[PDB]
Amino acid sequence: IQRTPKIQVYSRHPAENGKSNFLNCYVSGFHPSDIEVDLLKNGERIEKVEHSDLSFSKDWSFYLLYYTEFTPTEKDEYACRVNHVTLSQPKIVKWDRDM
Amino acid sequence: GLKEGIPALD
């Protein structure tokens, strides 16, 4: 089987400019497990990005949390870029304050 | 704690 990932991008705590926080990209509902997830700051790839240990739901589909520390601002845009065999080209979800 | 051994298919 081949299922496309669902993607959520959001802050761990409520977002205030100049206050340290964690940027999360939760990817779930995908198969097979091989996947590429990158966090972006104004288009550029963030380098110290950690992630959870692979696991799966009742329907066997996988989920992963990719996260990094960050200090938001008014100007800086943040996004999750995901690539997977089910996707024609990589999908990019921008972070909203409605996180 | 893990089980002491799991069944192989064959």
Partner: protein, 273 residues
């Protein structure tokens, strides 16, 4: 109600070398152990402070056992490739989940041992822990072999006895977190889509366990039209988040109420703008 669960994924790498193997252990929604063949330690590692309480004999045991699990899945990947008559060129996935539930009395409630190949059910132990649910004719062969070798009987003895003994131990030792509920910190937000139309969004944050219900109701009556629910998601710190929104005519915000059910609330909460 409590559970212990182990999840195993093995992924063949036809280019070179042996399959990727990742194991993780959970108590309810708290991950407590990991193993990853690609990692450098080649040990089962702790992922919650309350399991670091365990001595070396524990870590040697779980490491030995998890490596043997790893081999079992390597061999399983070969068996299945043969059964499904697939080439050696493709990468394939095997996944196994097992574990136990206990009731509030900490007594055996339920057992689990199920298996998938390339993300589809292959074989599963039934609720009675005596019979199997084979998905297709390959799994049928496994079913006959496992019946002949009394695999059910062996798993049953673990899942009914030893499994619940660990779960009990872990629950005592982790009681400060595992037996504490974290109630959702709730609030609401407003987003003017236009002069005429507006979005209410009802938030639940920093809660544990993951199980939660968020419902909207207009004028004291459940509304599903023009709503949205996101999947429950991990905060990163061991707790979870969720929200629900509703689209509302501008100036009618006071009709709509958000209802929040969760184990850590004695009574369900209600929110209103």
């Amino acid at each position: 109600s409590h559970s212990m669960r182990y999840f195993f994924t093995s992924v063949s790498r036809p280019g070179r070398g042996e399959p990727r193997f990742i194991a993780v252990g959970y108590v309810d929604d708290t991950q407590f152990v990991r193993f990853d063949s690609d990692a450098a330690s080649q040990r089962m590692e702790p992922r919650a402070p309350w399991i670091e309480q365990e001595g070396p004999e524990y870590w040697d045991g779980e490491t030995r056992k998890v490596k043997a699990h790893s081999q079992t899945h390597r061999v399983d990947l070969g068996t299945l490739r043969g059964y499904y008559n697939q080439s050696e060129a493709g990468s394939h996935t095997v996944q196994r989940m097992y574990g136990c539930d206990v009731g509030s009395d900490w007594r055996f409630l339920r057992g689990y041992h199920q298996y998938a190949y390339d993300g589809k059910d292959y074989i599963a132990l039934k609720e009675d822990l005596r019979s199997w649910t084979a998905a297709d004719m390959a799994a049928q062969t496994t079913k006959h072999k496992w019946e002949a070798a009394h695999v059910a009987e062996q798993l049953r003895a673990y899942l009914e006895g030893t499994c619940v003994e660990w779960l009990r131990r872990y629950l005592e030792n982790g009681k400060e977190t595992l037996q504490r509920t974290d109630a959702p910190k709730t609030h609401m937000t407003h987003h003017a889509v236009s002069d005429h139309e507006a979005t209410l969004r009802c938030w639940a944050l920093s809660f544990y366990p993951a199980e939660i219900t968020l419902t909207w109701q207009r004028d004291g009556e459940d509304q599903t039209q023009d709503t949205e629910l996101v999947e429950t998601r991990p905060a990163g710190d061991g707790t979870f988040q969720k929200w629900a929104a509703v689209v509302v005519p501008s100036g009618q915000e006071q009709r709509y109420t958000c209802h929040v059910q969760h184990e850590g609330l004695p009574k369900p909460l209600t929110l209103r703008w």
